[PDB]
Design a protein around this ligand. Structure first.
Ligand SMILES: O=P(O)(O)O[C@H]1O[C@H](CO)[C@@H](O)[C@H](O)[C@H]1O
Ligand SMILES: OC[C@H]1O[C@H](O)[C@H](O)[C@@H](O)[C@@H]1O
Ligand code: NA
Ligand code: NA
Lengths: 479, 479, 479
């Protein structure tokens, strides 16, 4: 069972310079404001911000050592990524494939396009694409033979074959190793893409997806760990996860609040809270940017287009999903490239109101480090690295964090985080209150402990009244 | 009684450098083209382009002296702003409140939020304040006490309390002082917010708003002045003003004409002219930019959206009404930030035709100085000060005005202005003529005097025939 | 009688530097891929991209000499513009009008506005003019007298008077001179405006328009030439032209295919092909923007708007029809300012599939040179010179053309052009084939010859099977 406390989402080398500077910053500022951390991929990687690991058993020396991770485990929960979809092309398992060919003992670990034979154009159009290329990479073997393997993301990320056995072996080995280092929560990165079957969407293919998911969850349970599957699609998939003793992502909340605050409208927000999946990990911003499909149904389409158009001026080019038309297919707005604070027009009152509502939403709240520091869009960083999502992946030196931590808005956010991590009422049961169509009233009760949020979306006001048990009186939280 | 002549809207320091340079500019070019001036707030002020005056009894020395004001009153009518809603926090009256507290003899001059007690969320959301702030400012007294006062606009503008008596006294004193300096027409700035009553919108609350207006109008009439209440809302309020012997604003005309010219459609224009309120002060441009709510009803919503979408490319970011996440919807725009000349695609024929139709609309026509000079959007000025409305508040040096007066289009406007200010037919009765759905025919008749406007909205042509009484023949105005 | 072969639409000075470089470029690459040329106006001109000729009897020395023109004849058909509506104000015929006044022998060559007497406002609003000014130019005579002449287009273009006799000779003189130089096909520029009658639209006035149009066609037939009247309005006029032994423009095809490919819909396309007027000259791109009114009816309004919204991002500001304030309404756009290659999102497959459907559409296919070279929108050329249509009027040096000819997509188009020009089946009869509502099946048969196109609009695939007479078997055209 995890600690019902705020978690920090952070890179290893983007607060300070390495894992040691990250820990130093946590104890100075967050020592009684968080109960866990999600440390973004810190393995040896050759692409995509750590998400192309050569192995999950080593720490990139540029970041530190395994001892630097275990320094966190003594006091905090530890959430770490398990890239169940893919491993690096420089990994030992895939390098062995290049040398030996199909005779390699790791051959059945990867998805070979040639198993399927001819793939009709109709079956191609079912599959969505995350780059502007067909999801198939042609590699040259050591002996000169050319073959193609499945490749969803950048070409240095080779997808694993969950129709064979080696992939389950490799993941279970990874899981055993990570939990031995104090890992509580396994974020199953890109879990939706593991299920491939020609004639289907090759994404969240039912019921295979539930078999893969029940398997990892069981494997995680021997090793004393729970799972956090990452899926960006219709919220119904979040309920499927929740209903299998796993933690879903509250991905619907970020775009729902952006709308709710911008238009002073609590109707759709209140409806979602009344029925939101339980045991979920709530977020406002992530390392990826605000994802839209996660709010379909939760928010009517016409309001989604309003939301997208409202962020368009404050946001870079969006990340999009495409099909068998890739090059020049426009596609579907997938993620808005924008910090959550710029998405709220840098409105301190509005931003604190979002976090208050997040923290009272049932589930473990994660705060992304840029959001923690009220960071703005990093134009300069995006233009030098070319990575479109780096606009939300600010680098902070120990200097820059201490100064941003003193911003009035960040002091306010740290008051909530202390309150949400420590006050016992959040360990009880959630009771939504009646309110008009422009405000939200949320409360938690655990015995005599009680706290009550009231947010007026017209004026972006945040009020929390809590019961001080040591005196019995009702005080106002100062934030 | 005012002169039925064209009026000039102008700031003190934006033609030349002060009130003396303004007067120099008027005598050189406009001496027989206008009958009055509306000089925008020229008092000591600390916020919002002059509309936060410390007193109505002083002239900001940066602009000149009261003698510089009276230089106009001998030959021209004088329209001056009376900020009936609010005065500055640096005013003598409010500074006494901070020093002495509620022991101040000026205490009951301001609205104290604690008077109302608890305000329900519904009664807050009803309130018509367009900032994403509660209309409440927390001030610190000299003795350390913190209390809250009503504050509609920027925090340097403290709202006045018309449920007590001190506020009426202060207004009566301001009126006495301003009329003693030769002010004919008191522009009642933002009078709509004078009415505070929890449970209402606190804006144009009926029938209280009309008692405040009947009172000020009587006070003004004693001191030889008429009133021009500023209200930007549904035109029904302009008739209520008209029907209480005060001058309403023709705020419906500017966007009504823009559509009419852009689309070659006179239907909604002729319909409005046939029923437009009496005794109004007609404008095309003001110091604020084209206001949308004022034409709702006057013009169907679908045609307003046509207008809004048509101006979007030629205009800066629009001024928005509260919590409007649908930023391209008639219900979201409050004022379009654009000079009137850029709104007509800098088309001389159309711009003159607009002024002609304005000049034959019943009521006193005001010409804004930028419009007078065929000014274009000042990108540089808006980008230099961050004030979005400064795109319509060009600075002119005396040379730059001498230069603009020689532009062919301004010579044309100057001929129309001479005609509307001097030709006697406008002192008679307005007689709308029949026309097709793409043109307007307007005429004035006063005894033997008669003048007739014809505008073909297809081709932006303006044609005026007048009767020369000293010869009896009908001549064409050359413009 | 013309060659049933692909024609090139090209300027004189925009491939290379003059007509000699054009001849060099044509022979180097197109010598057996086209059977004729449309050389855009190469006369002495002072307005509107060459369409204000002082005479049709001279070649602008900036372009070359008549000998450079005759170098194309004998091997290629020659299509040349005849501006039947208007000639330049610097022309010899009109200057004589300025010098002598109505005493000029060329007086009855032009339309004098005072002839009509008063024109009621309704009779002015009827006039089909796409500018916002009366089509009336006030000229000053040498003797100082002021008179007005009819002027549809720019003021350097004075309209001709087909109520008199002088206009018919001038055309008969022009036609005689042009055909003597080897011109086969006279493009009758803007013929719709030749009919003036107060109380009418002054555009395509029936039955007068056919009285004028049957006349020119015979004068052209007398001199061994056929006619290509250009009119941009409803397609009903295209058949009206077709039924009088003249070549209409397939102006409906370009936006029809754009919709059909973008939305994978062959319904409206097949319907058109089944009934399209023939003996027409088919085009995809022209020297003008993609024209919308020419597809009204052929395509439902809702589907045209689908096209407009899809092109909006890849196109410059569209050319508008008169007083169309609703800038996102089918009835408002006149021409889309866009090269045809950018209109299909630089999709090689989609662009070739469009050209394939064009080449099998009954009628002579013209290929515009920008389309020939798969040119993209020329931002740089448009922002200079201010001409909005220069976004589709790329300049190419001889090197730049040699280079574009090596583009894979241009090699494919160049294969089609050779096939369409040489394979004899196109000289036979057209037979539309059955296909589903998202694909097109077109075939031609002439004796032993047979060729068959199949285009899948879902995937932009192009297949042509033809019967090779040199072997008797059915082969696949490789493109
Ligand atoms: O959050 P997303 O967009 O669904 O997918 C995520 O996993 C991918 C796997 O490489 C990476 O691109 C990023 O970690 C992120 O985009
Ligand atoms: O505070 C008074 C209000 O009205 C004034 O006319 C101005 O537009 C501005 O100062 C404000 O919007
Ligand atoms: Na809000
Ligand atoms: Na017009």
């Amino acid at each position: 069972l995890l600690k019902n406390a705020v978690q920090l989402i952070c890179y290893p080398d983007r607060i300070g310079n390495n894992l040691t500077d990250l820990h130093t910053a946590v104890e100075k500022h967050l020592s009684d404001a968080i109960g866990g951390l999600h440390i973004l991929p810190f393995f040896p990687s050759n692409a995509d911000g750590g998400f192309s690991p050569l192995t999950h058993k080593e720490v990139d020396p540029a970041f530190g050592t395994w001892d630097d991770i275990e320094a966190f485990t003594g006091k905090y929960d530890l959430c770490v990524d398990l890239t169940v979809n893919h491993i690096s092309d420089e990994s030992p398992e895939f390098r062995d494939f290049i040398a030996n060919g199909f005779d390699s003992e790791y051959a059945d670990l990867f998805v070979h396009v040639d198993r399927f034979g001819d793939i009709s154009p109709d079956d191609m159009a079912k599959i969505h694409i995350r780059k502007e290329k067909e999801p198939f990479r042609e590699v040259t073997l050591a002996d000169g033979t050319k073959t193609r393997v499945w490749c969803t993301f950048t070409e240095q990320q080779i997808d694993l074959n969950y129709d064979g056995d080696l992939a389950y072996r490799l993941m279970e080995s990874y899981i055993g190793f990570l939990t031995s280092k104090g890992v509580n929560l396994l974020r199953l990165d890109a879990f939706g893409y593991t299920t491939k079957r020609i004639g289907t969407s090759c994404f969240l293919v039912e019921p295979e997806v539930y078999r893969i998911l029940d398997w990892i969850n069981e494997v995680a349970f021997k090793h004393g760990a729970e799972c956090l599957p990452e899926v960006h699609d219709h919220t119904s998939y979040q309920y499927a996860i929740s209903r299998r003793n796993m933690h879903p992502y509250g991905f619907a909340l970020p775009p729902l609040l952006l709308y709710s605050l911008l238009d002073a409208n609590s109707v759709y927000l209140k409806n979602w809270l009344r029925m939101c999946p339980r045991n979920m990990v709530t977020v406002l911003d992530t390392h990826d940017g605000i994802c839209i499909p996660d709010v379909e149904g939760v928010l009517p389409d016409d309001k989604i287009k309003v939301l997208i158009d409202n962020i368009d001026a404050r946001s870079a080019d969006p990340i999009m999903r495409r099909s068998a038309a890739n090059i020049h297919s426009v596609g579907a707005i997938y993620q808005l490239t924008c910090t959550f604070y710029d998405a709220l027009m840098q409105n301190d009152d509005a931003y604190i109101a979002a976090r208050a509502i997040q923290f009272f939403t049932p589930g473990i709240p994660q705060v992304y480090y840029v959001g923690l520091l009220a960071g703005c869009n990093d134009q300069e960083l995006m233009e030098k690295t070319g990575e479109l999502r780096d606009i939300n992946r600010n680098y902070y030196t120990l200097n820059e964090m201490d100064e941003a931590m003193e911003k009035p808005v960040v002091q306010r956010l740290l008051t909530l985080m202390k309150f949400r991590t420590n006050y016992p009422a959040f360990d009880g049961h959630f009771e939504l209150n009646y309110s008009n169509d422009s405000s939200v009233a949320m409360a938690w009760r655990h015995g005599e402990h009680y706290c009550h949020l009231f947010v007026d979306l017209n004026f972006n006001t945040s009020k929390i009244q809590y019961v001080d048990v040591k005196s019995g009186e009702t005080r106002d939280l100062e934030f």
